[PDB]
């Protein structure tokens, strides 16, 4: 029922015989439909026959909401933004130990804030009293 050919050639002689192609799924009394729309989170048939009764699936590059309501991309896991409705993504994210900093971070002795290791001994005092450019830093020839 979609005018793909832009001239209606792919929708000519379409009949209610209910004899869709093997690949195409058949809504009970609505239309045939492509597999790529079966179980895709969207009700494409009138009665939602193409979506009801199925279950979600995920590659190694995706993450499951706790309630099974979505398969979000793994990039959005532990990002500071609630994506899943049940907030299953940002729960259990790594917490910086009390008043310290992660392994990837130098800590400014002047105020306790954290900056990446890549900024320690880089010639630019990032910390508020220049703690990150201490005299222990190797001189750059």
């Amino acid at each position: 029922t979609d005018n793909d050919c832009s001239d209606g050639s792919d929708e000519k002689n379409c009949q209610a015989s209910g004899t869709c192609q093997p690949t195409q799924f058949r809504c009970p009394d609505h239309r045939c439909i492509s597999p790529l729309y079966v179980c895709d989170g969207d009700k494409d048939c009138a009665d939602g026959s193409d979506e009801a009764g199925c279950v979600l699936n995920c590659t190694s590059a995706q993450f499951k909401c706790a309630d099974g309501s979505s398969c979000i991309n793994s990039r959005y896991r532990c990002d500071g933004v609630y994506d899943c409705r049940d907030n299953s993504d940002e729960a259990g994210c790594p917490t910086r130990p009390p008043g310290m900093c992660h392994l990837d971070e130098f800590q400014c002795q002047g105020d306790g804030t954290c900056i990446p290791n890549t900024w320690e001994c880089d010639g630019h005092p990032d910390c508020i009293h220049g703690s990150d450019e201490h005299t222990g830093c190797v001189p750059k020839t």
């Binding site: 209606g8 379409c14 609505h30 009138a46």
Partner: protein, 522 residues
């Protein structure tokens, strides 16, 4: 303190005089204020007013189920109908004139002989039933059939009780009364009754024509398609998108998304001029308030609904909240509603929305099983809205309050991809993007829509050019611009303490505390 009934009982003041009997003496129900409901309320059978949002939500608030009547899309019949038979499979109803006639006249085809069941069509035990009217052949043998205004009683096939034929879909095209002859049709003023069922336009009006977009140009023809005339041809690879008219001034308006402009012309093709060319980029559809001299416009680059005068000067945005993908628009200035469609909001929900003619009191008129709702048209005499859907591929109708949902067409073979729709008297003309033609359809029930004009391109919005399509009504803003400083936008008749209008200010101003005088925005 509280109100004490004549029978010796205390009842709270809030529930005193609210259509609730309370004390058996009905002391609180002898007096009747129970004034008529406002625009924002639904009116129950017993006169109780409830908020519009309570309608078809699942709660029988009216105590009469008047607000929960047929919220479903006519999934199945209710005991079928008199002088009709029920197909078990899908709830389709056909009459005895088709049952056992030798042809499968419903999807299951159960109404004929089948080798898998052994049911045969002919007489039978009906000789013992002794029906009130007649017997006739069914695949189970002889069964009862009864005249108009005769339906079988409670689990008593032999007994027929009088029935209200006024409740059957499409018994009379406009109006019906059941006090005489078990039913009788009648017509609104301006129409004239033909036969005993159909009301047609009186010949006292000039003519009736249908205007539609060929997909490139603006066409026009008669109601039978004998002759077609190109009204205005598109320039610079233009595209006629959405069309509407104004019978009083003989002007026809059409939008253009490719040229990003909105035009207007006389019916003769003279004086074609640009109405708007600023900030209008994808005007999907259009509508005209014919009594207030306004042009309501749809925009989809920045999803909003505008209102501008017929010449295109005074502009103000009405709806912007959660408008998602607005496609369809229709209005009834005589009563004062605005109907518009939305095939996806900022919230995932698609819906068909109702609002006052100034954007106030938005309501989800139809929410369930709505898919991709498209252009909307109104039956101005029966108070119903007709909308088409491109996802679930149906043409459906609900009343102004969203109750009594009935489907007039359905299926991938019937209406594979409707876009635009318009009513005249008994026919819905609807564009379809798959069969690539403007199609003529009966407005009650159709087995198969007829082809009206077959195009080489995707057609678009259709309208029927006639005077009766724009009934007369008084103009609330006629009394010296309604007192508003800049712009007078019409609203519900019951809004603004019955004044029927709300003042607005053009872009760059805001309303003061008087709601009459505009002040420069800060």
């Amino acid at each position: 303190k509280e109100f004490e009934c004549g029978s010796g009982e205390c009842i709270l003041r809030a529930y005193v005089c609210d259509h609730d009997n309370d004390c058996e003496d009905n002391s609180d129900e002898r007096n009747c204020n129970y004034d008529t409901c406002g625009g924002h309320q639904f009116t129950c059978s017993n006169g109780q007013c409830i908020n519009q949002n309570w309608v078809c939500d699942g709660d029988d608030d009216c105590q009469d189920s008047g607000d929960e009547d047929g919220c479903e899309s006519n999934q199945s019949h209710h005991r079928c109908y008199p002088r009709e038979w029920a197909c078990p499979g899908s709830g389709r109803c056909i009459s005895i004139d088709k049952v056992c006639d030798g042809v499968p006249d419903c999807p299951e085809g159960d109404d004929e002989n089948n080798v898998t069941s052994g049911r045969t069509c002919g007489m039978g035990v009906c000789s013992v039933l002794n029906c009130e009217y007649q017997c006739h052949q069914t695949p189970f043998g002889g069964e009862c059939f009864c005249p108009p205004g005769h339906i079988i009683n409670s689990n008593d096939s032999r007994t027929c009780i009088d029935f209200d034929d006024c409740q059957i879909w499409g018994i009379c095209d406009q109006k019906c009364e059941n006090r005489q002859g078990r039913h009788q049709c009648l017509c609104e003023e301006g129409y004239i009754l033909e036969r005993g069922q159909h009301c047609k336009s009186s010949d006292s009006f000039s003519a009736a024509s249908v205007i539609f977009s060929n997909g490139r140009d603006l066409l026009v023809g008669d109601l039978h398609g004998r002759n077609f005339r190109i009204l205005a041809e598109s320039k610079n690879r233009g595209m006629v998108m959405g069309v509407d008219f104004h019978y009083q001034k003989h002007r026809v308006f059409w939008t253009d998304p490719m040229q990003e402009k909105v035009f207007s012309t006389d019916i003769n093709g003279l004086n074609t001029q640009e109405i708007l060319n600023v900030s209008v980029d994808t005007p999907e559809n259009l509508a005209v308030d014919w009594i207030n001299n306004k042009l309501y416009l749809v925009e989809t680059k920045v999803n909003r609904i505008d209102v501008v005068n017929l010449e295109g000067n005074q502009r103000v945005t009405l709806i912007t909240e959660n408008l998602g993908h607005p496609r369809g628009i229709a209005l009834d200035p005589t009563v004062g509603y605005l109907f518009f469609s939305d095939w996806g909001s900022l919230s995932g929900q698609p819906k068909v929305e109702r609002a006052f003619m100034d954007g106030s009191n938005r309501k989800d008129l139809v929410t369930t099983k709505v898919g991709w709702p498209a252009g909307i048209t109104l039956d101005l005499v029966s108070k119903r809205v007709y909308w088409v859907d491109s996802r679930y591929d149906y043409i459906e109708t609900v009343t102004y309050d969203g109750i009594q949902r009935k489907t007039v067409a359905r299926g991938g073979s019937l209406v594979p991809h409707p876009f635009g729709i318009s009513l005249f008297e008994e026919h819905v003309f609807f564009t379809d993007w798959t069969k690539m033609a403007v199609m003529k359809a009966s407005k009650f029930t159709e087995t198969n829509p007829q082809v009206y004009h077959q195009s080489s391109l995707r057609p678009h919005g259709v309208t029927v050019y006639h005077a009766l399509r724009q009934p007369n009504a008084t103009n609330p803003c006629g009394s010296n611009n309604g007192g508003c400083a800049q712009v007078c936008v019409l609203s519900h008749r019951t809004d603004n303490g019955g004044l029927g209008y709300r003042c607005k200010c053009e872009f760059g101003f805001e309303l003061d505390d008087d709601e009459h005088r505009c002040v420069a925005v800060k």
